[PDB]
Amino acid sequence: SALGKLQDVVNQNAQALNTLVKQLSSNFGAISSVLNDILSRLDPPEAEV
């Protein structure tokens, strides 16, 4: 654990990127987290919402 100061920075950036990428799996109230499924299923009046 001697080089913890540098490892902590690497870990914080890795966690930040993993968190950002994992947010793409969230629905945020939408019917699906996948944009392609929404566009494949819905027409613009509902797809835009």
* Interface with another protein (CB under 8 A): 31, 40-43, 46
**Closest approach of another protein to the CB of residue 8, in Å:** 45
Per the CB < 8 A criterion, the answer to whether 26 and 33 are in contact is yes
Q: Which is closer to another protein, CB of 24 or CB of 43? A: 43
Reduce the secondary structure of the chain to three states and give it as a string: CCCHHHHHHHHHHHHHHHHHHHHHHCCCCCCCCCHHHHHHHCCHHHHCC
Q: Which is closer to another protein, CB of 18 or CB of 40? A: 40
**Closest approach of another protein to the CB of residue 7, in Å:** 45
